[PDB]
Ligand binder design. Sequence first.
Ligand code: K56
Ligand code: ZN
Length: 207
Amino acid sequence: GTILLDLAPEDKEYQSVEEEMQSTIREHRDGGNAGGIFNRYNVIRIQKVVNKKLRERFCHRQKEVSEENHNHHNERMLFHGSPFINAIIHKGFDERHAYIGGMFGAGIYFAENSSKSNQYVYGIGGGTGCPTHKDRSCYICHRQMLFCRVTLGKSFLQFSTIKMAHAPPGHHSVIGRPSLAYAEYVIYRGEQAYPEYLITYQIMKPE
Ligand SMILES: COc1cc2ncnc(N3CCC(CN4Cc5ccccc5NC4=O)CC3)c2cc1OC
Ligand SMILES: [Zn+2]
């Protein structure tokens, strides 16, 4: 099955991830409502995720995309936030659990910003917050999110909202961009993301 490797805070890889996570915070048009109000994360733990059968599926699908797109699979590290991280680290992302209702349809949703994904950790628009306090802005309950390798191949740039079941013909990903507040990345096959890093953390209260 799946194996989680603890990264030590002195591991360069640990700081690499934290750095990405911390710096990619932005303030939102919420009032920080859904993800909660903060400027910084307390990172409790970071584990690297290792799963043979998942990696084999990811690697092969890259090949495919690489042929379809002039030998460049265009892999980017992006954050994912949702309630189903636990499923995801043993099984992998799975488009069968993605439905048409989403902002861009039956895709799996990522972000270049940590703080974007943190809005989705307890559901769409924060659902009813953390299990235990019903608080979108719990500064105590441990949150989880993922820092993934995503195979984008050839992205179809999108500006308004459109609902679609699959990637558009000739493309391998959608990107929804500004004029929308921050960048969103959407794939429509689970094998085009590998959950490389599991981050456990809390959001800190400003003074
Ligand atoms: C136990 O059930 C699940 C197992 C899953 N195993 C793997 N991948 C899953 N997903 C792939 C598709 C994803 C689409 N979404 C839905 C969503 C809802 C609320 C907030 C954020 C998101 N982000 C997504 O990417 C949701 C997670 C899974 C989703 C599951 O429940 C829906
Ligand atoms: Zn809580």
